[PDB]
Amino acid sequence: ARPRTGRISVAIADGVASVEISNLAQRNALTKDMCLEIQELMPQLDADPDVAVVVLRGAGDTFCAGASISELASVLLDPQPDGSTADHLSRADSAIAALSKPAVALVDGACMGGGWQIASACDFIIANERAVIGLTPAKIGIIYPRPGLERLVRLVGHANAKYILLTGQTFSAPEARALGLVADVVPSESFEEKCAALVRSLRSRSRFSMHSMKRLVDLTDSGIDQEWAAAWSAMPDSPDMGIGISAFLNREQPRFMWRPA
Amino acid sequence: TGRISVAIADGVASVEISNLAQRNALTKDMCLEIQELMPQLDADPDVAVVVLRGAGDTFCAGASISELASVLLDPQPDGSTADHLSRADSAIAALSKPAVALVDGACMGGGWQIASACDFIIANERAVIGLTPAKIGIIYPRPGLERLVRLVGHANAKYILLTGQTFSAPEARALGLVADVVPSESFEEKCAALVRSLRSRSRFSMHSMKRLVDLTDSAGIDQEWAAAWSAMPDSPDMGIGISAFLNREQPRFMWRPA
Amino acid sequence: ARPRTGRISVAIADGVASVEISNLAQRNALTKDMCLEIQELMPQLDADPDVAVVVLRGAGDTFCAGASISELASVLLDPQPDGSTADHLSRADSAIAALSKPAVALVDGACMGGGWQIASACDFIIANERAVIGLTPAKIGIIYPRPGLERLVRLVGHANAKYILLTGQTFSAPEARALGLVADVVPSESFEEKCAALVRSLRSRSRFSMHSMKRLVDLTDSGIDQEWAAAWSAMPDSPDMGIGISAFLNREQPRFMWRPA
Ligand SMILES: C[As](C)(=O)[O-]
Ligand SMILES: C[As](C)(=O)[O-]
Ligand SMILES: C[As](C)(=O)[O-]
């Protein structure tokens, strides 16, 4: 019996695109094809006016075991006609990081190796208490790809990054949180309810605010002055500020209107 | 009627954000008062330490929403606009003296920006913190956004700003938004002892390190290090500290600014 | 009765160099001679092919009480023939931080003043739950040396660094961890077992991976493009990647082979 093929699927409802990493026979490991699919899918979701928020999640009760080891060179060192190589896992990471819309990773079960790199490409990660996280290049003889390694260092600092990468240890979700690898941890019995509420919240906020701030955060410590001037000047011209002020003063929830162009 | 008040005793300037009807929201006038007050405190030889807190049991609800444009987008005769909340922030962050924010109750919107302009924040366990520009359709001002990103990292900053969620003080601490959390029953006593501690440390050490920390990651910095390192043994505090330690007693330090 | 002289010793077994700060009469405070010994030793350890990992630990049940206060000027302000002064504690710190091999500080008991500086020059710190950490220059009227101050600022952020330095408070290990001063905390009853397992882990990982990543982490936000290109290109030429892939696919532990040249 041959395994069911690994794939990245998407389901869209109420402005939320649920992107699922589905390769359960390999604990949701990423194949080269899966990386290519993410790479193609993220710009389509960014252009789709029916999508306001992206949610990234593993099929079943596990997030992602990393690049598939049985095809590791094709994922990280894939030869190209011009004589370079391509790291498809990093290109997938970048496609997710370039989304202008909010993206959240919901991590349950195991998030291993390049799984964290994909998860961390989202804006932030919410983990189930029972999840485990390990970055294991050192268990395999490879190097964590540059964008992942730099992002780690910036999120958790130099010392924690070394603890994480040199030992390749597996951490519980509350440990991962203490280290800075994830933004929040939710008990298992309420994980589903809390993630659904979180998503509803992101669907209620001003999209002008979220788009602007996501972009301005991403530029911080990466010119940047021109982007700030443009966003600050767009702010009163967007309809969301007036709607937000007046909702607040009337003690009601705002019905925001700005949409990406 | 909203106002900034100050009381000075034993080298401690207690600055209070007082606008209780609006849960200590900042008006434009209040921002202008902070802006004027900080440099006076810095020049006052009777002030060693500044403590910032809210009137009653609540810290600051942010820029007053009913006058939001006046606080953040105040038009100026040359055609620019002013952000008075950021100017206030910057007046607090330019203090050369140690400044601590004591946060109880709610610290919302720009409240965190004012609090975080101090050197660090100590929160009561029952306090709540939310940064809510995304609930209003605005953008967090640049100094505050950047400071946030540098204190909590990119991912936590987005979690905080994109959701605009309200966090308990322990959660805020886990995220990096405040430096420590004290249970409610012992908050006042512990804050008072913290303040007594700052008042008994070497002021040469505090002044120097606050400044060197603030310069870290902003030739210019080399000269400041060389000047401070060279001033260190010429200040009296080092000899007083060494000898107090060896005699097993608490040092009575003497260096004073300016 | 004269005190037993403070010293830095090393013991080497199974590729681990255990470096011990031994000056128990002063709670393992560092004298000038001890700082000079660290400074001379670290490069020897880096060049010794029998050493793969360095572990830094205090004699007995305490780590380090900082520069010895009774000889503070000779450690921090040591006069030199050209009229300048030398900070031996910082030079010891730099010698440790220049190690290309993995280095871990195991902190028990007290780690005070410049003790944190020496510990934080290692890649990361594992603390016993009963350990205490305080950075106390402000209790003494001095300034934390620049490499330490900057490292602190980068590891814990500006606000936590000012809380730590301006108060000079002593923190418990779990507090120090919450602030970012140490990477992990282990209960006292299992500290020895868990440190030994940690060290065995580091001795099991790919040394190609550890060397490369340590160096790339240390370069992040410090030329860097060329280093990345060289390491990435070396990766498939090193034998460790092929050994790591096969071991994983055969469900066994890898026996890695790369060694530094
Ligand atoms: C860094 As690449 C060649 O995988 O785009
Ligand atoms: C015009 As401004 C940057 O001083 O608020
Ligand atoms: C900064 As020095 C001359 O003590 O190495």
Automatic annotation (TrEMBL), chain B:
Please identify the protein, giving its name as recorded: Enoyl-CoA hydratase/isomerase family protein
Matching PROSITE patterns, A to Z?
ENOYL_COA_HYDRATASE
Q: Which UniProt keywords apply?
A: Lyase
Q: Which family does it belong to?
A: Belongs to the enoyl-CoA hydratase/isomerase family.
> Tell me, what's a Pfam family for it?
ECH_1
Q: Which GO terms describe its biological process?
A: fatty acid beta-oxidation
Q: What is the lineage of its organism?
A: Bacteria, Bacillati, Actinomycetota, Actinomycetes, Micrococcales
GO terms, molecular function = isomerase activity; lyase activity
Cite the PANTHER family for this sequence: ENOYL-COA HYDRATASE ECHA18 (ENOYL HYDRASE) (UNSATURATED ACYL-COA HYDRATASE) (CROTONASE)-RELATED, ENOYL-COA HYDRATASE-RELATED
